Symmetry: C3
Subunit: 533 residues, 3 copies
Amino acid sequence: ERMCGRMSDFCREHKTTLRYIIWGILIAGYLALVIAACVMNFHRALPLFVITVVAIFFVVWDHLMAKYESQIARFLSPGQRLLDSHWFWLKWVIWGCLILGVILWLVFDTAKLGQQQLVSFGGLIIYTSLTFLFSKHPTKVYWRPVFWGIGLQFLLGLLILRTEPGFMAFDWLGKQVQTFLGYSDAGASFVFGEKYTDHFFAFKVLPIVIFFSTVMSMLYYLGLMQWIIRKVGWVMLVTMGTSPVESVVASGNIFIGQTESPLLVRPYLPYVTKSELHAIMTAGFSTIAGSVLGAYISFGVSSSHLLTASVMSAPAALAISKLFWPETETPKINLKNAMKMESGDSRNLLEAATQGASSSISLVANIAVNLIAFLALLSFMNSALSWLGNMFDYPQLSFEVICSYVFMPFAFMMGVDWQDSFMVAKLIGYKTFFNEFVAYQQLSKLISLRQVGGPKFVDGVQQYMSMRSEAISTYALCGFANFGSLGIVIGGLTSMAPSRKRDITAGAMRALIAGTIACFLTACIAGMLTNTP
Amino acid sequence: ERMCGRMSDFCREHKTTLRYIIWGILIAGYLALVIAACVMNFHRALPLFVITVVAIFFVVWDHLMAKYESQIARFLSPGQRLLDSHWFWLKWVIWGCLILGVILWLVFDTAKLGQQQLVSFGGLIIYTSLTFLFSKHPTKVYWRPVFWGIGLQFLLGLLILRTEPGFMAFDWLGKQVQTFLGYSDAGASFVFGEKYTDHFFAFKVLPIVIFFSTVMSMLYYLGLMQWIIRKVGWVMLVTMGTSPVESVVASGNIFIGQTESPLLVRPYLPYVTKSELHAIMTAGFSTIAGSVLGAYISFGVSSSHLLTASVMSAPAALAISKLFWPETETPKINLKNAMKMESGDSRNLLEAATQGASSSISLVANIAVNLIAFLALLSFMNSALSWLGNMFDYPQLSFEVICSYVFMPFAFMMGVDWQDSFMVAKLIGYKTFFNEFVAYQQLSKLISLRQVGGPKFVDGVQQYMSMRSEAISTYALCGFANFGSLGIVIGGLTSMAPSRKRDITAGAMRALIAGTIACFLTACIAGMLTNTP
Amino acid sequence: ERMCGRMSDFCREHKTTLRYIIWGILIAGYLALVIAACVMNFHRALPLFVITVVAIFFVVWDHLMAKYESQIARFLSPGQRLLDSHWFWLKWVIWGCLILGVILWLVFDTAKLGQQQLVSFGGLIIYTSLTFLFSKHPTKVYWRPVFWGIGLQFLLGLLILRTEPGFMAFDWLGKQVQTFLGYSDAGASFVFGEKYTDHFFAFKVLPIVIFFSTVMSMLYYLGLMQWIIRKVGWVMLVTMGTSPVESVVASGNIFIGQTESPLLVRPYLPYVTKSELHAIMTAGFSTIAGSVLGAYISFGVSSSHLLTASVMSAPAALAISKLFWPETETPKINLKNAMKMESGDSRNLLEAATQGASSSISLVANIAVNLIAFLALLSFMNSALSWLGNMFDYPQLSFEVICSYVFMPFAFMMGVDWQDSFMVAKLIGYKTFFNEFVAYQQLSKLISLRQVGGPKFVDGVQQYMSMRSEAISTYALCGFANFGSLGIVIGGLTSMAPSRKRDITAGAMRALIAGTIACFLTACIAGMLTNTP
Ligand SMILES: O=c1nc(NO)ccn1[C@@H]1O[C@H](CO)[C@@H](O)[C@H]1O
Ligand SMILES: O=c1nc(NO)ccn1[C@@H]1O[C@H](CO)[C@@H](O)[C@H]1O
Ligand SMILES: O=c1nc(NO)ccn1[C@@H]1O[C@H](CO)[C@@H](O)[C@H]1O
Ligand code: NA
Ligand code: NA
Ligand code: NA
C-alpha cells in the first residue's frame, strides 16, 4: 500500500494549502454565479448582489479589526486624552445641549401630537422615579447606564417609527417572517393531514414553534447568532458602561429565551455579582424568544412592533436593573471570557436541526397544558365571581372587570386615552396572572374586531379600541414576566449554578418587577412617538 | 436614606402586629360582605352563610383542641380508668348487644329485601373467611381492626344509602363535580377548536384530568387536603387501632393516587414494618385518584356511587391488610411524625397550578397509549380465539365468553342475580386484565343501553342489566388493582425507598389481592343495603 | 397451623415433581384439543397441526443438540480431519466448480433476462471493488466473509424470488402482517374516535408502531426472538467465520433497531475490537426495525420485498464491514457469552406489554416532529432554489432536479433502466438527506400512480416507472442510514459504552457508508434476479 502512504504524506504535508484552495474555489464559484446572474439581468438579481456586498464588507471589517486592533487603539488614544483633559468643563456644555434638544423636541413635536404623548413622557418619568425610590441601594446609583439606555431607546424609536428608511426596513423584515412561518404547513399537512386546519392552534401554530426552534438551533451551530450578539453587546457595553456578562446576556435575550440565554456564560455564572445576576434575570423577564414569535404573528399581532419591542427591551432592562439594584462589588469576568460562547455539540447542520427539533417537544407540551389549565381556572373564577356578584344585584362581576380598574393607572401613564385604558388594563392583568399568550390572543381578537369595521359600541359596551392603543399594548405585553415564570427561572438558574441558590432566590421578584417596568417604559416611548389617527 | 432606615426599623419592631392587623382587616371585609349579602336577601345568600359558619366552627374547634389538649385528656382520664376496670365483664354485654343488633337487622330488613341481599352478606362472610384462611400469619391475627373496619363500612352505607340526609348530601356532592368538570371545555375549545368534540376522548376527557390535577395541586398547596386527611386518619386510628402511618396513607389514598400517596410519609418509609408496607400497597390498589374521577363521571358512571366507594375503600383496605398480613413487629413512627406532611415547593398558588398542570402530561400520555395497546391486544386475542373456536363449530369463542364463566362466582357472592352475574364477570375480567378504564367504558355502554329503553333481549342475548347490578359493578370496579400496576408500583416504591426493595417485592401480589378483596367487600355491603327495583 | 406446615413441607419436598406434572397436564390438554380438532375435521385444522408438529420438532431438536453435543462433535471430527488433509488440493476444484457455476448461471439466465441484469452484476462488482479500494487496511483483508455473505445473499434471492415454495411462503408471511396491522384500529377508533381517519398518519399509522413495539416486547419476554436470533447468528458464524458478537448483533438487527440491538451484548461492549464495533454500527445502519415495518406496509410498499431485504441485509452488512474495516486484533468474547442475552425486567407478559407500550411514546413523537421539520425545510429549500433559478430563466430548479443527476449513476449500476434511474435518484436523495420515511412515502405515491393506470407521460414529464424499478428502490431504501442517525447512534453507543467514546466516533461515518453500500448490493442482487415485465 505504498500509494496510500504517499497520499497520506501528501495530505499531511500541505493540509493548510489544500483546504484553503478548496474554499477559494467554492468562493470563486459563488462569485461567478452572482456575476453571471447580474450580467443576465441586474434588476432581478439585485438582492443577491446586496447580500454578497454586505457579507464581503462585514468579513473584511472583522478581519481588519482583528488584525489592526492595537494600531487603532494607539491612534485613538490621543483624542481620548484630550477629551479627558477638557471634560471637566465640556460635560456641562454637552449636558445642556442634550437637555435643550429634549425640550425643543417636546415643545415642537410632542405638544403638536397631543396630550397623550406628553402623558407618555410623564409616565416614563414617573416609572423611572418609582424605580429609583424603591431601589435596593438608592445611594449607590450609577446614572450613566440609565440615561444611556433611555437615550438608546429614544434613538431606536426615532429611527424606526419616525423615518422612512427604518420604517420600510422593519416592515420588510416583518413581512419576511410571515413568509417564513408558512413553510411549517408542509409538515403539518402530512403529519396531521389536509384537515390540520380543523384544529388551528395545536396542529398549525405549535409546528411553527418547532420549525423556528430548529432554525434557531441551526443558526447557533453556524455561529451567525453569536456574531450579532457580540456586536449588540459591544455597543451597549461601550455606551452604557455595563459589565460584559450582563451586556452579552441582554443582547442574547433578544433572540433566545430566559432559560437558555444564561448558557452563553454558563462557566462564569458562579463568579458573577448579585447585580449582574439580577440584571440577567431582568433581561430574561423583559424579552421573548424567537421560537414563539411566529405564534404571536399568526394570532394577528404586528411583526414590526414585536421586533422593535424586542430590540428596545435590552437597554431598558439593563437601565432598570442598574437603577433597581446597582453594583456595589467588583466584577471579575472580563470581556474576552464573556464574548466567547461555547457552542453546542453538533457534528453537522442536520444533527443541529434534529437536536433543535427534539427540544421543542416539552416546550409545546407545556404551552398547551398551561393554556388548558389557565383557561379552565379563568372560567371557574369568572363563574364563582358571578355567583358572588349576584348577591349584590351585580352578576356582571368578573376577573376582567376587576382588572380594568386595578391596572388602569398603569395604562393611563403609558399614554392610552381614558376609554381604552380600561381595555388595556384587562390585557395587563391577563399577562401578569397567566401569561403573554392569552393577552396576545385577546389583543388579536380586538384587532380583528377593529379590522372588520363593525360598531365601536353595542349596548354601551366598547368592542374595540384605536390602533395606537393596540401598538402600546403590543409593546407592553412583550415579555415572559409572570409569577409562574418565577419558580421555573429560579429552578433552572439554581440548576445551572447550584452554589448561588441563596442569591438567586433573593432577586427574582425584583427582576420580575424590573422586567415589567422595562416593558412599560418601552410602551411609554412608543406611545410618545406615535401620532393619533 | 434616613426615611428608608426608619421604615425598616418600624417594620422590624412590630412585624407581628402589622400582618395580624392586615389579616384582621381582610377578615372584617369578608364578614361585612357576607352580612350585607344576608341583609339584602337571606334566602339567596344562604349557602355563603353556611360555608362561613362551618369554616368558623372548624377554626374555633381546631384552636380549642390545640390549646386545651392536656386539660381535655386529664378530664377524660377517669372515665377511661372506670371503663378499663369494668371492661372484663362489660365486653360480653357489648358484644352480645352488637350481635343481637346484627341479627335483628338481618331478619327485619335484609330478609324483607330479598334473597340477593342475604347472598351478599354470605359473600362478605366468605371473603373474610378466605382472607383469613390464606393469611400470612393466621395465628397472629388482631381482630379489632377487621371488625371495626367492617362496621365503619356498614355505618357509612347506612348513613349514605338508607337515610335522606346522607343521600341528598352525596347526590348534591356528585352534582357539584359534574358542574366542575365542564370548565375544562373552555380550554379544550381553544387549544383544539370548536371541533374538539370530533375526538371526544382525547380532546375532551383528558383535559378534565389535567384540570383536576391542577386543582388538586392547588388544594395541596393551600393545605386543605391534609386537613381532611388528618381527621379521617385520626378517626380510623382511634377506632381500628391501626398505625399512624398506614392510617394516614389510607386516608390520603381516597383523594390521591397510589404513586403519590406514599410521599406523605416519604421520610419515614425506610423504617416502616412489613405489615405497614403491605397495608400501604393494599390501600394504593383499593382506591382511585381524584384526577381520573371526572373521566369516569363523563363516561356516565354515577358520581355518588364513586364517592361512596372511594370513602368506604379505606377501612376495608386496612381490615383486609391486617387480616392478610398482621403485624408481628413493633412500630417505630409516632403520630406526630406521621401527621406532618412536608408540603411541596411552590412559592404561590399559580406556581402550584403550573406544577400540577405539567405533571399531567405523562399521566394522559400513558393512559392513551395503554388504552390503544390494550384494545389492539383485545381485538387480536378475540380474533385468534374465534379462529380456534371455529375448529369445533364454535366461532363465538371470545375473551368475554371465558370471563363470563371464570369470574361468575365472585359476582354471584356479591349479590348479583344469576342472569347479570355473567355480565358483571366480563367487567371483572376487563378490570383484572387491562384496567378500570375499559371496564367503566363497558359499564357506561350498558348504562346507556338500559337508559334508552330498548329490548332487554335480542336473539337470546341479554343487552343490559338491572340498576342494582350496575351499582354493585360500580363499587367493585373502583380500584387501581391490575397486574400492570404491580410493576410500576414496585418500581416507584423501590425508588422512594431503595433500602426496602427486598421487602417491597415480596408483598405486592398479596397487596393486589387484598385490594381486590376490599373492593369486593365494599360491593357486598352495597348490594346487601340496596333494594331490588 | 399444623396443616399449613404440612402443606409447606409437601410443597418443598417434591417441588420439581409438582410443576413438571402441571406442565405435563397442560401439554396433554393442548394435544387433546389438537387431536379432537383434527378428528372433527382435518382440512379445517391443518395449520394448527402444522404449527404443533414444527414446534415439537424444534423442541426435540434443541433437546438432542443440548444433550448429545460432545458425541456429535466427536462423530464429526474424523471427516473434518480428512477434509483438512485433502483441502490443499480440493480447494482449487471447489473454487473452479463455483466459478463455472457462476459463469453458466450468467450466460444461461442473466443474459436471457436482458442487459439490465448484467448491469446489476457489474454494479455489484463495482461496489465491491470500490469498498476494497477505500478500505481501512487493504492489506489485511480476510476474503472468506465477503464471498460467503455475497453467496448467502445470492442463495436467499434464488430461494425466495426464483422458486414457487419460497415465493409463496414470503407472500403468505407478508399477507399475515397486513392482517396483523389492522388490529390497532380497535384502539385508534376509541382513543381518537370514528373520525380517526380524518388524520390518517398521526391517528392510524403511529398506533401501528405502538402495537408492533408492544408485540415485540412481549415476544422478547417470551424468549422467542432470541431463539431465532441464535440460529441465524450461528449460521452466519459457521459460514462466514465472523465473531460471535457481531454475528449476534447482525442477526438481531433484522428485527430490532440500531439503538436497541447492542443491548443484546451490553456487558461485553467495552471489550470489543474496532472492527467489531464498526460491524455493529454498519449492521445498525443497514437494516430497519419491526416497529416501523407496519407503517411502510401501510404506505403501500410490498411486505414480501421488505422482509426479503431485511433478511438479506445482515450478511451484506457483515461482508461490507469486514471489507471496509478488517480485523487486525484478537477477539476476546466467546460464543457462549455472546449467545446469552440478558432478558429485561418484566415479571409477567402484561408488564412486558405495558413497558413496550410506554417506550413507543418518544419514538412516535420524534418521528412526527422530524417529519414536520424535514418537510418544512424541503419546502423552504425548493422555494429558495426556484428563486435562484429564475435569475437564469430556469425557475424549475429544485432539490429533486439536482438529486436526479447527482445520484443517477448509483441507480444505473443497480440495474435500473436509463429513464427510471433519474426517478430512483430522487428517492436515494430523499433517504440520504432526511430519512427513509419520506422516500417510502414518495415510492408509495409512485406505486399508486402506476396502479391507477393513467398516462405514463404528461407534458413530457414521467409520472411513474416500472415494477422492477419499484422493487429495486424498495430493496435500496431499507435502512436507517442518514446523517441525522449518525449523531444519535454515537450518543447512544457512547452512553452504553462510555470508555469507547474515542473509538465510536472514528468509525461511524464508515459504518454509515458501509450500510448504504450493503443496501445497494442487496438492490443489485434483486435487480439481477428479477425479470423485465
Ligand atoms: O420559559 C419559556 N422559554 C421559552 N423559550 O423559547 C418559551 C416560553 N417560555 C415560557 O412559556 C410561557 C409562555 O410562553 C412564558 O411566560 C414563558 O414563561
Ligand atoms: O397509577 C396511576 N396513578 C394515577 N394518579 O392520578 C392515575 C392512573 N394510574 C394508573 O393508570 C391506570 C389507569 O388509570 C390505573 O390502573 C392505574 O394503574
Ligand atoms: O433510530 C431509530 N430506531 C427505531 N427503532 O424501532 C426506529 C426509528 N429510528 C430512527 O427514526 C428514523 C426514521 O425511522 C430512522 O432514520 C431512524 O434513524
Ligand atoms: Na429572551
Ligand atoms: Na388512591
Ligand atoms: Na435493525
